[PDB]
Symmetry: D2
Subunit: 115 residues, 4 copies
Amino acid sequence: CPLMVKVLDAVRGSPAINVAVHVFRKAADDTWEPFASGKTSESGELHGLTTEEEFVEGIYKVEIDTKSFWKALGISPFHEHAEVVFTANDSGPRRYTIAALLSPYSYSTTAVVTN
Amino acid sequence: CPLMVKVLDAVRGSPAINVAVHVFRKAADDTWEPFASGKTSESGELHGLTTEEEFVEGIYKVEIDTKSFWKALGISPFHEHAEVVFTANDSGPRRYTIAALLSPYSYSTTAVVTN
Amino acid sequence: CPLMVKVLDAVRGSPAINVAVHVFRKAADDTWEPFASGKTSESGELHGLTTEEEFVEGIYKVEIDTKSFWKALGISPFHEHAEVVFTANDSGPRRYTIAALLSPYSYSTTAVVTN
Amino acid sequence: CPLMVKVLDAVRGSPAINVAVHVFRKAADDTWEPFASGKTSESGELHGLTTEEEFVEGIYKVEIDTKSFWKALGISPFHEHAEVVFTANDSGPRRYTIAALLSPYSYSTTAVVTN
């Protein structure tokens, strides 16, 4: 599990469940290619996006579909999604946790990277 | 104006208005003594808490009454208040902006220290 | 001045100065088209990106070049840039402040929308 | 495990290890009484602070000793500590995770509360 995404709700103080997550990888022609996708669990976590073999060095974009999450709770939020763009495995394989903390008009995102 | 407090509302994406703010200075006995207080303005700021002459080196505590703020809105909050504790140091000329971004179950606070 | 961007440095507790900022508007083809850009000022703000007349309803992307900012400081950053994607809506009178608070492996972004 | 504290480092993108944590409970005479204390592990987590039996309803203060953490890394941070003040178990027993994300001049804290 070299990539995990975790999403929390700062309004209710709870994991954000069923949040859609899309991962893309920058291609040789400078375009964002689809890499993996999924939805968070009851714990607000999304495991199994990828394997160490497939998760090669590159520039990755993690898009968390925060608007649909808020809408479904009856809230009209400011952002369309939260996006996280980063270079991965450029020094060798690492394990990445991408965490997002969501409010209707604000979010924070943090990476925890372990060897 | 060496000390300013600014509060934002992450749920509505607005300044947090009429929020009570209390500042304490730590006394020789280790107890907190009242130092300055007020309510934030329509822009979510609180100016004029102290002067250069009164704001001497020491340990200060800024308490932001977040709980009454959320209660007025109708949103169950987690925290009793937000607390920012720091030592004022002389270093050269310095202005302190204590900012706070509020969500019902999360807050962040940042110090912006400039000349 | 319907759109302003403000960037703070969480590691030094200062405005983030000379940070490049690019704004894109989403075209009919779904591609991002350049819309406005600049660098933050000594106060960490970027004013004058657009006018009321040009800032019509649509989907916008604000990209903040955080990676070059940390590189200039000497601190290894995680992210390639910070990205804020949102729909501008008409609704009554409105001013948009996109704020970003930067750390090497974390950032937060908040929209302050006022009249 | 009705109370857990987790601390992350936003400069390195890593758990904050060996961070001292002190918990107090408000006493009938309005004073902060010592309740429990400990230090975060290699995972940045602190388990075993208390038991469901001892963790009665009340107002609790969780003090995270962020200054000593930064100093030991050679950084002179702004805050003395991060403090989290909240009412607990006022609707029945809950499980509380208090998370703190640390930068030298900024921090955020979030509570995740589960039944």
